[PDB]
Amino acid sequence: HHHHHHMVHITLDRNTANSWLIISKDRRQVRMGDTHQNVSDNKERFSNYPMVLGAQRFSSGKMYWEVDVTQKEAWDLGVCRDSVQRKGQFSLSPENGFWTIWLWQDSYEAGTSPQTTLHIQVPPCQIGIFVDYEAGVVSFYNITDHGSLIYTFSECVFAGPLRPFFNVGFNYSGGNAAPLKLCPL
Ligand SMILES: CC#CCN(C)C1CCS(=O)(=O)CC1
Ligand SMILES: CC#CCN(C)C1CCS(=O)(=O)CC1
């Protein structure tokens, strides 16, 4: 792909984080802590899952960023509406305002409803995410495999401002403690 020139500097919004997450001082990395991180509750925090939003809001244009997923067993990545549900249980779908892919139990899937099997020959260590607001497109690229396409959501109905979306995943296994990291431009 040739989307690198639309690179944007993403930072994480502490106020949206699940209360177990630890966001680095530079707001570029997030991981699951082993307990509640001693923050007050607020209506923005994702309550049921280890999720956090980027601070940036996008309502036009073309945007590109990259996320490091090295040695993780489970994660979700993409974009979502600013108005997505924060509390209780919900599925990651375009109907609920999410355009995402994930790794779960040794398979990669796109967050359609129902979910779509992805075909990845080279497990990615970094993911590129491209949003074209006007065109209604969200695309995912395998940076480890020379930028190969993973998945394109087209005919997207964003229906609001978009935020970068992250899920570090649970760590029931003891094998998923590693952080998500926003990679430098
Ligand atoms: C099937 C599947 C999948 C991957 N995610 C959509 C979930 C999000 C909720 S969760 O509790 O973080 C488990 C992982
Ligand atoms: C956020 C949240 C939650 C659910 N928890 C009580 C734990 C979090 C740490 S764990 O290792 O994922 C086991 C499940």
UniProtKB/Swiss-Prot annotation:
Residues 8-185 form the B30.2/SPRY domain. The keyword RNA-binding applies. It is found in: Cytoplasm; Cytoplasmic vesicle, Autophagosome; Nucleus; Cytoplasm, P-body. It comes from the Eukaryota. GO terms for molecular function: DNA binding; RNA binding; ubiquitin protein ligase activity; ubiquitin-protein transferase activity; zinc ion binding. Keywords: Cell cycle, Coiled coil, Cytoplasm, Cytoplasmic vesicle, DNA-binding, Metal-binding, Nucleus, Ribonucleoprotein, RNA-binding, Transferase, Ubl conjugation, Ubl conjugation pathway, Zinc, Zinc-finger. The keyword Coiled coil applies. Induction: Up-regulated by IFN. Autoubiquitinated; does not lead to its proteasomal degradation. Deubiquitinated by USP4; leading to its stabilization. Autoubiquitinated. GO terms for biological process: negative regulation of innate immune response; negative regulation of NF-kappaB transcription factor activity; negative regulation of protein deubiquitination; positive regulation of autophagy; positive regulation of cell cycle; positive regulation of protein binding; protein autoubiquitination; protein destabilization. GO terms for cellular component: autophagosome; cytoplasm; cytoplasmic stress granule; cytoplasmic vesicle; nucleus; P-body; ribonucleoprotein complex. Belongs to the TRIM/RBCC family. The coiled-coil is necessary for the cytoplasmic localization. The RING-type zinc finger is necessary for ubiquitination and for the IRF3-driven interferon beta promoter activity. Interacts with SKP2 and CUL1 in a RING finger-independent manner. The RING-type zinc finger is necessary for ubiquitination of NMI. Homotrimer. Component of a SCF(SKP2)-like complex containing CUL1, SKP1, TRIM21 and SKP2. Interacts with CALR, CUL1, FBXW11, HSPA5, IKBKB, IRF3, SKP1 and VCP. Interacts with SKP2; the interaction with SKP2 does not depend on an intact F-box domain. Interacts (via N-terminus and C-terminus) with DCP2 (via N-terminus and C-terminus). Interacts (via C-terminus) with IRF8 (via C-terminus). Interacts with ULK1, BECN1 and with ATG8 family members, including GABARAP, GABARAPL1, GABARAPL2 and MAP1LC3C/LC3C. Interacts with TRIM21 and SQSTM1/sequestosome 1. Interacts with IRF3. E3 ubiquitin-protein ligase whose activity is dependent on E2 enzymes, UBE2D1, UBE2D2, UBE2E1 and UBE2E2. Forms a ubiquitin ligase complex in cooperation with the E2 UBE2D2 that is used not only for the ubiquitination of USP4 and IKBKB but also for its self-ubiquitination. Component of cullin-RING-based SCF (SKP1-CUL1-F-box protein) E3 ubiquitin-protein ligase complexes such as SCF(SKP2)-like complexes. A TRIM21-containing SCF(SKP2)-like complex is shown to mediate ubiquitination of CDKN1B ('Thr-187' phosphorylated-form), thereby promoting its degradation by the proteasome. This is E3 ubiquitin-protein ligase TRIM21. It comes from Mus musculus. The chain holds residues 291 to 468 of 470 of the full protein.
